[PDB]
Design a protein around this nucleic acid. Structure first.
Lengths: 54, 124, 146, 100, 23
RNA sequence: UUGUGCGCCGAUAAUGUAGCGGGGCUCAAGCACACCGCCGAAGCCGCGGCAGCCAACGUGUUGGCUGGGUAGGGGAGCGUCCUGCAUCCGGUGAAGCCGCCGAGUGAUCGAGUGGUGGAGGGUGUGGGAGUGAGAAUGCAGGCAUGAGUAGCGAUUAGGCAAGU
RNA sequence: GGGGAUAAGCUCCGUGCGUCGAGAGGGAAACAGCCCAGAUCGCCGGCUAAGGCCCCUAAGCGUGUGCUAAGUGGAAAAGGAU
RNA sequence: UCAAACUCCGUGAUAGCUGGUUCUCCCCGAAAUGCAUUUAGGUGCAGCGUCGCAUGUUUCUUGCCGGAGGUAGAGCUACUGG
RNA sequence: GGAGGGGAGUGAAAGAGUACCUGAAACCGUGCGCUUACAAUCCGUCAGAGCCCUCGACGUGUCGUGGGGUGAUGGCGUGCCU
């Protein structure tokens, strides 16, 4: 089908504000004497030397 | 000879859109939408200028009547009494009295009590 | 110019009415008058400045005619065939408070201010109330001669 | 302490110092003008009879002549083509009650 | 039926004085 | 047995009370007859400003009547551009634009001032008009809502290591 | 007054009758034609019309004498009935 | 794309037809009826509007006097018909 | 990585950077003040509480012949044109 009206500013921006993003929950790692912040999902793989840390 | 039209329009656009700072949506940005609402707006202002008189008078009367009824007299007979007594005070000021100084208003109430007819429902 | 009540202006009071065989209409009109504030000289319709009301013996309300058993309160859920009705007698013997409430609520504005007024209406099916620590003023419904 | 002045086909509650706006009277800024009265109050009691009220009169000083607010009119009707613009400022005359 | 009658009978009110337009 | 004033039954449809506008009302807040007051409109009056027709007078004052208005007839005006003529401001900062403060009965105005900016403009009188746009399923360019949605082009199917 | 079924918010004529059209405001619950009334602009002034005064809705649960028992009021016929 | 292609030109074809037509105020202010009509949705003249000049109350209203009418109504051995 | 940018410079000015005179509106966002999650809104208008900014007379904060932005809540109110 097809809309019928020019859906307003309020409604538009309101719903548009649901299309957002969340940030992964970060955690320290003692990468060879120094520290970097990495998700928890990848913690073991970092401590074992696979994660490409730039 | 050729006359570009830009200035001669910009003038009234500026006027209107200055006069619609507070409106909500396309009534606050766009000339073809704020012009209409200005028509309706000025008209409703006119009508309300004619009618706020009755609004305030209604208000004044409600105040007067409640004041009186707490002094145990009705509005209608109060005004009968003041008309008879030739008292001149208008309703705006009777209400102001009611708010500020109920004593003086009670005195006026008593004047009307005194000056009313004896048999109010008489055939006179 | 004319006086308009500010914030630190209102003065409240707790009135209490008896419903001992009083007529529902009289009682309800009186309560509406009090709650809306048409008895003080500080009245303004934009402001709620009336007085709290406590109704007692509400199960003693007695009406005229056959309204006890020919009159029908209605409702509607919103669903189809979800119109359901009740007499006044059934509704007293179920819960009496609702009769007097709805009666009064129809004597008020149905606007935001009316909803904010209904807060100021307390009704109790018996003679009692927990609101003695306000020392409620007894109101006796009277009619002013003229 | 206060009184109620009649003027402008209107009435105004006053006391000494209470500045007021009214219709256009006929005088110069700084002059004085007297006025009739409807009510008077000395403390608690009242003067409410016409003979005493004619014997009493209030005196005021003309601060300044003035112009009220700008009032826009755009009379309008639909499907017609009838607009009519018009405007108004009402002339005023500020009084200051000297005494009573 | 009902609708026309209620029109033609609202006309017998007091502020209309017995008459209304389109009955 | 007559005539009356209110009344009863007859009475009975489909989204939901639903043939008082609602609550509610016969402890009439209902019908009738008289009585008293009152509320109520942009009506009339009261205080002020403008305007048109007539009249009276004096070198434009007052007064009475009047002033809803579409098709339409008539009258008087603002604004834009180019110009004839006379004068004024302008790199010691014009225009144009964003404004603030103010004005005019209105179209509109600021030789009233700030910011930006960088070279022409204003005034009075006359002349001439490509002379005022909100609508033509109007034209050209730009940008929105739909929307960060539908789709990403077959019915063969991709994967792991190393690489730069 | 005609046509129609002496039906139509039907159709066709009359009318120094009206209003709407081109006419706002108040009342009629909302309601171009009904009743009142014909808007120069302003006022936080007063009196009234039609209509209405229990609360919502400003104004009277007004005065006096009688009727109503049907929620008549707040649709209705032929006819029936102590 | 075919009940007679396409392109340029005539050509800015023509439409009793639909739509659209831009700044302000002041004064007055309608009609929707008649005759005709290849005509009924259009148009011509008369009607009602305004502008200018002329004629000055001739218009309108109320009262009184003078005049014809065949309507409502009523009547019928006062005619025609039932 | 490069695009692109920040400093240093040229230049009277880089709010003249080869996307460049001026550089409007729609439109797109960032901050600051008010307001908004029990409410039925041609989206406004009349009254107006409360808070925030400002000018001025004064006095340890304070009303005013004030003015402006928002504006709870109440009444009224059926888009524009043809």
């Amino acid at each position: 089908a097809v809309p019928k009206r020019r859906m307003s500013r309020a409604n538009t921006r309101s719903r548009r504000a649901q299309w957002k993003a969340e940030a992964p929950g970060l955690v320290t790692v003692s990468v060879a004497g120094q520290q970097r912040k990495v998700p928890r999902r990848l913690l073991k793989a970092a401590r074992l030397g696979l994660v490409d840390l730039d | 000879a050729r006359v570009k039209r830009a200035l001669n329009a910009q003038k009234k656009r500026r006027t209107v859109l200055k006069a619609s700072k507070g409106y909500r949506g396309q009534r606050s940005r766009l000339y073809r939408k704020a012009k209409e609402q200005q028509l309706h707006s000025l008209t409703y202002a006119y009508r309300d200028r004619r009618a706020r008189k009755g609004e305030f008078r209604k208000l004044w009367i409600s105040r007067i009547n409640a004041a009186a009824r707490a002094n145990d007299i009705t509005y209608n007979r109060l005004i009968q009494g003041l008309k008879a007594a030739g008292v001149e005070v208008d309703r705006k000021n009777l209400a102001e009295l009611a708010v500020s100084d109920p004593a003086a208003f009670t005195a006026l109430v008593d004047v009307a009590r005194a000056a009313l007819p004896e048999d109010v429902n008489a055939p006179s | 110019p004319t006086y308009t009540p500010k914030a630190g202006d209102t003065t409240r009071s707790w009135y209490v009415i008896d419903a001992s065989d009083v007529v529902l209409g009289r009682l309800a009109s009186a309560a509406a008058t009090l709650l809306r504030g048409k008895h003080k000289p500080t009245f303004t319709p934009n402001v709620d400045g009336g007085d709290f009301v406590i109704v007692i013996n509400a199960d003693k309300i007695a009406v005229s005619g056959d309204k006890l058993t020919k009159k029908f309160a209605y409702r509607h859920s919103g669903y189809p065939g979800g119109l359901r009705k009740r007499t006044i007698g059934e509704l007293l013997e179920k819960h009496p408070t609702r009769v007097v409430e709805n009666a009064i609520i129809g004597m008020l504005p149905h606007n935001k201010l009316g909803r904010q007024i209904q807060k100021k209406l307390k009704v109790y099916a018996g003679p009692d109330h927990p609101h003695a620590a306000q020392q409620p003023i007894p109101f006796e419904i009277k009619q002013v001669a003229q | 302490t206060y009184a109620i002045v009649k003027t402008g086909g209107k009435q105004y509650k006053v006391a000494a110092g209470d500045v007021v706006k009214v219709e256009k009277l006929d005088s110069e800024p700084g002059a004085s003008v007297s006025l009739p009265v409807a009510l008077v109050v000395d403390g608690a009691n009242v003067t409410s009879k016409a003979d005493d009220l004619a014997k009493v009169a209030v005196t005021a000083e003309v601060l300044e002549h003035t112009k009220g607010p700008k009032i826009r009119i755009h009379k309008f009707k639909n499907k017609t083509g009838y607009h009519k613009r018009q405007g108004h400022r009402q002339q005023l005359t500020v009084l200051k009650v000297t005494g009573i | 039926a009902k609708r026309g009658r209620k029109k033609r009978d609202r006309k017998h009110s007091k502020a209309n004085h017995g008459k209304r337009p389109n009955a």
